[PDB]
């Protein structure tokens, strides 16, 4: 009785914010120990009653407060009570060390440590009748902050910490993490519901009055603010829930509007808005697919429209076609790299769209074939390489080459035009040729590059032979005219044998001399001369003034003949020159069109006479211009040769497959042929069927008896 009065007097001093001497602390500890020496239930009840009375008569102060007042009261009183309870637990270490431990193991039910007892008393006395007011005031303060006001965040943090700590099990007495039963059941659910309501109102109100572009900035700012709030004055366990709920309510409900605005932003180039949209929608799972599909469709439509605007002129102007394709690809590649953060899906969409509109477009529809694009690309390359920024445009052309399905057409056309550029010395630079060869090495295989290098080897051999022929002329009688020759392998060049021709007598000397020299140095070899690819220069001395004019061998033959007679008949010019009807007609038309040979339909009865008098403006005039129909005929021939080569390649692939696998089915054979030949062109099933049928007739493979639709190799 007398002891308890001292403990009460001392402990009531503990629960006031006034310092006490360490001697008084040890004095209270000693009196607690003396009271201990079961019989400790009376003291436990005494402390319980004192705590209940203290909370009961403290609650009367804060029953009628509102708004920030109750928050300040709760925070200050909670901090003071927390420290006082810690001190009291420090004082009563003996009791909770021995008596409480003994009670817990023997099977007591309502015995706790001093600190836990204080927490339970607080929860059951003061927290319970004030939690509604405290939570409502905290929510009102949060709403005030969300509307653009500066608040005291230390009021919310104290309430949150008090709610978190007042969640002890009080029965298990052992735990690892923190218990959030009171925190979730009193604050968090209401907080998330209020956040959802607030943002679902604000987003609708903003979208009803402002465009989407400003709403995106609003949403980004709101998300940053929510991260700030949750990391500043909330618990760490609500971060993921708040993030998901805010992202859903701010983005996932407006995906239709976002998809509608994506097309508008694509139509009128706005890269920043597209980047902001990509950043916003990237958070929603599986939300980027619709954007990818829309971008692919937009790129395809833009490419088709850009090609269509060029019109019919693009069918014979490679530069315009390739430049349009390059412009579209460059623009959308830059857009993908800048706004879409170089994502794999958008790159794939761009590649798919480019491959779609490069192979099939308006130009290919006019030509009724998909092989016009590689032809135009090859012609553009030839124009570039004919007579600084060349490297960049060659690299861009090579980027375009990746999307071409049928690359064999490009290879054939490039080989033919390189042969033309090598046989006649008109090349811009050898360095550009080497760079193009290296690029083709990187892209194409190795057989094509070796086939190309054979031509360079032949050119070098001819260059070596020319000077050594010149040396042989010095130790002999000389020649009246400057002579240059180019000897090429027959099987390594795409040139065909010339038509019938009668060599003019002014050129027989060089012919005989070089034929003798080549027969002497090389044995077993025969030379065939192409007079349709040979060119020279003529000098005239019967005009108003001295001109030198460069012309083909055919033009020399049909022009030097007029040295004897001023007038001639085309039916007799044929006998004089031994040129066929069509070639002579075209070359005569070319000569006539230059106004240097006066007399449109040409007939054997027509008469042609040399025109003197009128001359040319310049001293050097070129009359070696290409015929109009020759290019078209050459294109048709080289297009037919590609199909023939395709058939032969398919036959060879089937033969190899049958030699390796002795017995094979039909679908497996088709799949193997497609996967073997895919790097050059995509074959068609009827072509493979025709190749199989023609291979059967040649006694290479035969259909097995029974088990139909199955083949077998035959030796």
């Amino acid at each position: 009785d007398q002891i308890w009065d001292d403990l009460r007097a001392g402990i009531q001093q503990v629960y006031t914010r006034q310092s006490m001497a360490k001697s008084r602390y040890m004095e209270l500890y000693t009196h607690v120990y003396n009271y201990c020496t079961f019989v400790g239930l009376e003291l436990y009840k005494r402390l319980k009653e004192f705590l209940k009375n203290y909370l009961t008569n403290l609650l009367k102060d804060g029953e009628d407060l509102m708004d920030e007042s109750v928050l300040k009261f709760y925070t200050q009183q909670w901090e003071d009570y927390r420290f006082s309870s810690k001190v009291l637990n420090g004082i009563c270490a003996y009791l909770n060390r021995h008596w409480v431990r003994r009670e817990c193991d023997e099977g007591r039910k309502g015995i706790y440590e001093i600190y836990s007892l204080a927490l339970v008393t607080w929860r059951d006395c003061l927290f319970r009748p004030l939690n509604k007011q405290v939570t409502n005031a905290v929510l009102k303060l949060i709403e005030k902050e969300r509307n653009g006001e500066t608040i005291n965040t230390r009021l919310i943090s104290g309430v949150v910490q008090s709610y978190v700590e007042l969640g002890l099990n009080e029965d298990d007495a052992f735990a690892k993490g923190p218990t959030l039963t009171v925190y979730k059941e009193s604050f968090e659910s209401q907080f998330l519901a209020d956040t959802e309501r607030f943002y679902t109102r604000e987003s609708t109100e903003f979208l009803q009055q402002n465009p989407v572009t400003e709403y995106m900035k609003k949403a980004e700012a709101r998300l940053l603010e929510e991260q700030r709030r949750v990391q500043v004055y909330l618990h760490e366990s609500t971060q993921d829930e708040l993030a998901r709920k805010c992202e859903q309510v701010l983005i996932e409900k407006h995906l239709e509007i976002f998809h509608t605005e994506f097309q508008n932003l694509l139509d009128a180039d706005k890269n920043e808005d597209l980047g902001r949209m990509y950043n916003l929608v990237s958070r929603i799972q599986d939300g980027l697919g619709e954007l990818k599909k829309l971008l692919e469709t937009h790129i395809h439509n833009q490419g088709l429209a850009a090609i269509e605007k060029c019109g019919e002129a693009a069918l014979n102007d490679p530069k315009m076609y390739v430049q349009t394709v390059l412009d579209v690809h460059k623009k959308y590649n830059a857009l993908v790299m800048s706004a879409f953060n170089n994502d794999a899906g958008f790159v794939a969409a761009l590649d798919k769209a480019c491959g779609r509109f490069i192979n099939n477009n308006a130009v290919t529809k006019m030509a009724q074939s998909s092989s016009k694009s590689p032809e135009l690309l090859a012609r553009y390359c030839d124009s570039l390489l004919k007579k600084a920024e060349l490297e960049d445009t060659l690299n861009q052309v090579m980027v375009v080459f990746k999307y071409i399905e049928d690359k064999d057409v490009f290879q054939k056309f490039y080989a033919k035009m390189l042969a033309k550029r090598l046989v006649h010395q008109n090349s811009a630079s050898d360095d550009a040729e080497a760079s193009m060869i290296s690029k083709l090495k990187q892209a194409c295989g190795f057989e094509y590059t070796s086939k190309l290098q054979r031509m360079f080897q032949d050119i070098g051999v001819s260059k070596d032979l020319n000077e050594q022929f010149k040396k042989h002329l010095t130790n002999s009688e000389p020649l009246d005219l400057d002579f240059s020759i180019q000897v090429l392998s027959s099987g390594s060049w795409p040139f065909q044998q010339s038509c019938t021709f009668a060599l003019p007598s002014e050129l027989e000397r060089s012919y005989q001399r070089f034929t003798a020299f080549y027969a002497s140095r090389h044995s077993g070899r025969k030379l065939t001369w192409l007079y349709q690819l040979s060119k020279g220069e003529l000098v005239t001395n019967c005009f108003k003034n001295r001109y030198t004019l460069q012309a083909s061998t055919f033009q020399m033959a049909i022009l030097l003949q007029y040295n004897t007679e001023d007038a001639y008949t085309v039916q007799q010019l044929t006998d004089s020159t031994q040129i066929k009807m069509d070639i002579l007609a075209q070359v005569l038309q070319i000569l006539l069109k230059s106004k240097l040979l006066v007399l449109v339909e040409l007939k054997p009865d027509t008469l042609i006479k040399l025109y003197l008098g009128y001359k040319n403006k310049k001293l050097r005039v070129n009359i070696n211009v290409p015929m109009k129909t020759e290019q078209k005929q050459e294109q048709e021939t080289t297009h037919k040769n590609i199909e023939e080569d395709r058939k032969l390649l398919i036959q060879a692939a089937i033969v190899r497959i049958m030699k390796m696998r002795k017995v094979l089915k039909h679908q497996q054979l088709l799949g193997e042929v497609l996967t073997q030949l895919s790097s050059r062109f995509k074959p068609r099933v009827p072509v493979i069927k025709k190749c199989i049928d023609i291979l059967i007739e040649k006694e290479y493979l035969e259909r097995v008896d029974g088990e139909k639709d199955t083949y077998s190799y035959l030796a």
Binding site: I485, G491, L507, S510, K526, S534, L538, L648
Partner: protein, 86 residues
């Protein structure tokens, strides 16, 4: 009057061992081969072009194709056969 100043001519060289004829079959290189001229026109008769090799030897496509079934060497050479033209 016109006078020739300079000339730039182009020529091609081929083996003269065969006198414009196939080595495998005693027939011209431009006309139809024996194994296809004996038979009537068919799908096989459509393609009878001339095939060239790396050694710059020319035969009928069918002749060299049927020769290559058993042997793997150019008939006029001792080296492996590789197609380079058609």
């Amino acid at each position: 009057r016109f006078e020739v100043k300079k000339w730039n001519a182009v020529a091609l060289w081929a083996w003269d061992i065969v006198v414009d004829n196939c080595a495998i079959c005693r027939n011209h290189i431009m006309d139809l081969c024996i194994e296809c001229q004996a038979n009537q026109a068919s799908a096989t008769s459509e393609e009878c072009t001339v095939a060239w090799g790396v050694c710059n030897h020319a035969f009928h496509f069918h002749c060299i194709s049927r020769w290559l079934k058993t042997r793997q060497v150019c008939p006029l050479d001792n080296r492996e056969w590789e197609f380079q033209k058609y």
